[PDB]
C-alpha cells in the first residue's frame, strides 16, 4: 500500500478540500466520474457511496443497475488547480455490486484479474512504459475548436520557446510537481504533435497514470486556449498520434524477458512472450485501436518484429538489464489502457503458457517487400477497418476470456453500432466523387 | 572547465530549474531538443538519456537510431524567461551511438573532427566573429507573420527610439546578460533589417552562441509583436541577409596570419589560407548557403579584395591579434558547424598543400564581362542550389569535410527540396504564360 485512512483525513482537512471527486472508467475509457462534497468523505471511505453503474456500458446501458465504489486510498490526488471554495481531491474507484464483489463488467478489475492470471504463473508484476502523443488545436472566440494546429514545430524541433505558450513543457511541469515520474518529452513528426514519455510501473497503476494523464493534458490545455485530443487521424495526409507500450514481465522481482548470456540477451521467456502478441495481434487490434479512425492510421502497416524497422508491430529497444523490454508499435491513445493491457497481457501470457516461437527476426525488409511478398512469409496485415478488426475478436478465443462476458458482450456490440453508424453514412468525400460523374 | 557537475548541481538548485532543456542540431540547421524535468538531470549527466537519433537526418528520417546524448557542461546557461513552477536551462549535446562513439552522422560532432584535423597541423584555435543579419516584420491579430517591416529605417540609423520596441535593443541588452559578448549592432540597408556582431570566439564556442542567438532574438521578437526571419531573401526588391564571417587561425596561442615586417603583414599561412578558400568557394557555397532561396540574395564573383564592393573574401583593416579573413557570402541559413566545417576544411587543403593566391581585385566587378570570367579570376558563384549541389558533389575535401555520412544525406535532402520547387507551378509562372500562350 501507501496511504492510510487517517493519512487521507489529516491531508483533506490540514489541506482543504471541500470537493471529492470518486472517478472510474467505461468499458470506452472515458474518464467516468461522481462528485461528492468533502462532507461525505466518510460514506465514501468505507465504500458506501452507490452510482448508476449503468454508466460504465458505454452507451448502450438499458436498465439502472446500482453499485459501489471502493475508492483505493494510494491514489488520493490533490488538483493544483483550485477552486474558490476549496481544494479537490480524487480517488480512483473499482466498481462492486451490491454483494461485496467485484462488477466483472469494470475495466480495472479485469486486469487485476489478468494479473492476478499472471501471478498464477509466478511472475512478480507486469510494468509499462506509455509514449502517448497528442495534437493542440486552437480554440476560435467563441470555445469551439478548430483545426488551428497551435504551432509549426517539427520532429523533436524545440517548439515555442520558454517565453510564450509552451503548454507542452507546462503540463509536464505541472504532471511533475503533481506526483508523475516523466522520462523526458519533445515535439512529434506533425506540426502541432507532442509526446510526454513516462517511467514505468505497475499495469494497474500505469492505467491509472494514463487516465489521470489526458486529464490534466486536457485542462491545462484548455487555459492555453487550445484542445487537446488524442485522436488516431485527426487530419488526413499528417502524422497520425500513437501510444507505444514498453511491455516488461517480471519474476521473483527480476526482469524475466532478460538473458545476460542468451543471444539478444532474450531470455526464453521473451521470445515466447513476443510469439504470442504477433499470435493475437491482428486480432486484439480491434481493442487496441478502438475508434473508426484509429485504422486511418494503419495504412506497424505490417505485422513484424526486430531489433529495428521501418513500420514494425514489434520492437525491442536497445537498453538491456531491467530495461529489457518489448514496445509493441500499434496501440494509440483512444484505446482503454485497463483494456490495452488487459488484452495484450494474456496474448503474451497464452504464448508463455503455451510456449511459442515466432519466425527470424525481419531483417530489412517490410515496407518495399510486397504484401503477397509478406504473405510468402511470416508476415501478415493488421486489419484495416474496425470492422474487419471486429471480426477477428469475436473469433479469438483468449481475447474473449481476457475480457471476459460483460466487457466482450457489451464492447463487441456497442463497437458494432460505431461502425454501422459510419457505414450507413453519408459522407461530403462521395458527393465530391460520384454526385457528378454519376 | 568552467562548470564541474558539483557546481551545476548547486546551481540548478539555488536558482530553481524546473526543465533541462538537452538541445542540439540537426543535418539541416534546425535548432532541436529533448525536454527533461529537473527530477532527470542526474540520468542526463551521466549521459544515459536516449532520444530517436534519426531526428538529425531530418525531414528524410527512416528508421530509429536508438541514439545518446551527451551534455557539455561548460555550455551551461539559464535561459532568463521563466516558465512558472520554476526556470528553464539547458546544454548543448553531442549525439553518441549506444557504443559510446560518437555519431558520425552530427554537425556539432564533425566541427570538432576538422577540429583535430586543424590540430594535427600544430594550429591550436580557429576563431569566427559572425555578422548575423536578419530582418523583423509585424504580426497578425491571429499571431501570424506577415510583410510588414517593425521600421521604415535604413543603414546605421538610429532605428526605433529609445522609446517603446527596440526590439533589438533589448535582443542585445538580453544577450549580455546572458553571457554573449556584443561588439556593437546597427540596422541595416533595409527597413526592418538588423546586425548584432559578436566577438570572435572558439569554432566551437561561437557556432554555439550563433544557434543560441537566433532562438533569443526569435523569441524576445515575438515578446514584442514581430517575428525574426533570417530567411536570406525575405522578399524582392529589398536587399538580402547574410551572415558574414571572420576566420582566423592560430598557432600557439598567437595569431598566425599576422606578420609585422611582410607584405600587408599576411604570413604564407594567411595568403595559402585566402587560396583554399578561393578555389573551393563555389564547391561549398551549397553548404554555406543551403537554402534554394539563398541564390536569390547572390545575383557573386569569386575573387579576395583588402576592400572592393560585394567580393567573396575581405581582409579587415586591423592586424596584430585581429589579422582575420572575412567570407562575405555565407548567410545565416546555414547550420553553423557545418559552414565552419566546410571552410575550415576548404582553408586547411590550402595550408596542407601551398597554394598561390590569384591577384586580389581591384575595380568594380559589376562591369566584367563574361568571357573574361574565364581569363581573370571572375568565376563566378553558383546561380541556384542545383548548380551549387553538383558542385557541392565534385569537390572531394568538402566530401571528406562532412563524411559519407554527413555528406550522403545532405545532398539528399538537399535534392528533393530542389525537385520540389522544380516541379511546382509559382504564380509568377501563370502571371506571365496564361495570357501570352
Ligand atoms: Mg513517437
Ligand atoms: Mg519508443
Ligand atoms: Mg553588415
Ligand atoms: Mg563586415
Given at each position: 500500500a501507501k496511504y492510510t485512512r487517517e493519512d487521507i483525513e489529516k491531508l483533506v482537512k490540514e489541506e482543504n478540500v471541500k470537493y471529492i471527486r470518486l472517478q472510474?472508467?467505461?468499458?470506452?475509457?472515458?474518464?467516468?466520474?461522481?462528485?461528492?462534497?468533502?462532507?461525505?468523505?466518510?460514506?465514501?471511505?468505507?465504500?458506501?457511496?452507490?452510482?448508476?453503474?449503468?454508466?460504465?456500458?458505454?452507451?448502450?446501458?438499458?436498465?439502472?443497475?446500482?453499485?459501489?465504489?471502493?475508492?483505493?486510498?494510494?491514489?488520493?490526488?490533490?488538483?493544483?488547480?483550485?477552486?474558490?471554495?476549496?481544494?479537490?481531491?480524487?480517488?480512483?474507484?473499482?466498481?462492486?455490486?451490491?454483494?461485496?464483489?467485484?462488477?466483472?463488467?469494470?475495466?480495472?478489475?479485469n486486469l487485476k484479474r489478468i494479473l492476478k492470471e499472471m501471478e498464477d504463473l509466478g511472475?512478480?508484476?507486469?510494468?509499462?512504459?506509455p509514449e502517448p502523443e497528442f495534437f493542440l488545436f486552437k480554440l476560435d472566440e467563441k470555445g469551439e475548436p478548430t483545426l488551428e494546429l497551435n504551432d509549426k514545430g517539427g520532429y523533436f524541433d524545440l517548439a515555442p520557446t520558454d517565453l510564450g505558450e509552451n503548454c507542452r513543457r507546462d503540463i509536464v511541469l505541472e504532471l511533475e510537481e503533481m506526483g508523475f515520474e516523466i522520462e523526458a518529452s519533445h515535439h512529434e513528426v506533425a506540426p502541432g504533435q507532442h509526446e510526454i514519455d513516462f517511467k514505468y510501473a505497475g499495469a494497474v497503476r500505469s492505467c491509472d497514470d494514463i487516465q489521470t494523464f489526458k486529464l490534466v493534458v486536457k485542462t491545462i490545455a484548455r487555459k492555453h486556449g487550445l484542445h487537446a485530443t488524442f485522436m488516431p487521424k485527426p487530419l488526413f495526409g499528417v502524422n497520425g498520434s500513437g501510444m507505444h507500450c514498453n511491455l516488461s514481465l517480471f519474476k521473483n522481482g527480476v526482469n524475466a524477458f532478460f538473458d545476460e548470456n542468451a543471444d539478444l540477451q532474450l531470455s526464453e521467456t521473451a521470445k515466447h512472450f513476443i510469439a504470442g502478441i504477433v499470435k493475437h495481434a491482428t486480432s486484439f487490434t480491434?481493442?487496441?485501436?478502438?475508434?473508426?479512425?484509429?485504422?486511418?492510421?494503419?495504412?506497424?502497416?505490417?505485422?513484424?518484429?526486430?531489433?529495428?524497422?521501418?513500420?514494425?508491430?514489434?520492437?525491442?529497444?536497445?537498453?538491456?538489464?531491467?530495461?529489457?523490454?518489448?514496445?509493441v508499435r500499434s496501440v494509440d491513445p483512444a484505446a482503454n489502457p485497463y483494456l490495452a493491457l488487459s488484452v495484450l497481457l494474456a496474448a503474451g501470457l497464452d504464448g508463455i503458457k503455451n510456449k511459442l516461437e515466432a519466425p527470424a527476426p525481419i531483417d530489412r525488409n517490410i515496407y518495399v517487400m510486397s504484401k503477397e511478398e509478406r504473405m510468402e512469409n511470416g508476415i501478415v496485415d493488421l486489419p484495416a477497418t474496425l470492422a474487419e478488426a471486429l471480426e477477428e475478436f469475436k473469433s479469438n478465443e483468449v481475447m474473449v476470456k481476457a475480457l471476459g462476458e460483460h466487457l466482450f458482450e457489451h464492447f463487441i456490440e456497442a463497437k458494432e453500432i460505431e461502425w454501422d453508424m459510419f457505414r450507413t453514412q453519408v459522407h461530403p468525400w462521395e458527393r465530391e466523387q460520384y454526385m457528378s460523374q454519376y
Open positions: 472510474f472508467t467505461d468499458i470506452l475509457g472515458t474518464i467516468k466520474n461522481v462528485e461528492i462534497p468533502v462532507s461525505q468523505l466518510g460514506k465514501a471511505l468505507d465504500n458506501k457511496v452507490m452510482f448508476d453503474g449503468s454508466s460504465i456500458e458505454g452507451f448502450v446501458r438499458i436498465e439502472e443497475s446500482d453499485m459501489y465504489l471502493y475508492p483505493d486510498l494510494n491514489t488520493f490526488v490533490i488538483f493544483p488547480w483550485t477552486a474558490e471554495k476549496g481544494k479537490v481531491a480524487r480517488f480512483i474507484c473499482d466498481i462492486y455490486n451490491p454483494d461485496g464483489t467485484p462488477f466483472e463488467g469494470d475495466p480495472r478489475n511472475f512478480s508484476d507486469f510494468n509499462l512504459g480491434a481493442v487496441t485501436n478502438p475508434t473508426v479512425n484509429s485504422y486511418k492510421r494503419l495504412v506497424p502497416c505490417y505485422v513484424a518484429w526486430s531489433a529495428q524497422n521501418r513500420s514494425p508491430l514489434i520492437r525491442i529497444p536497445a537498453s538491456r538489464g531491467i530495461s529489457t523490454r518489448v514496445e
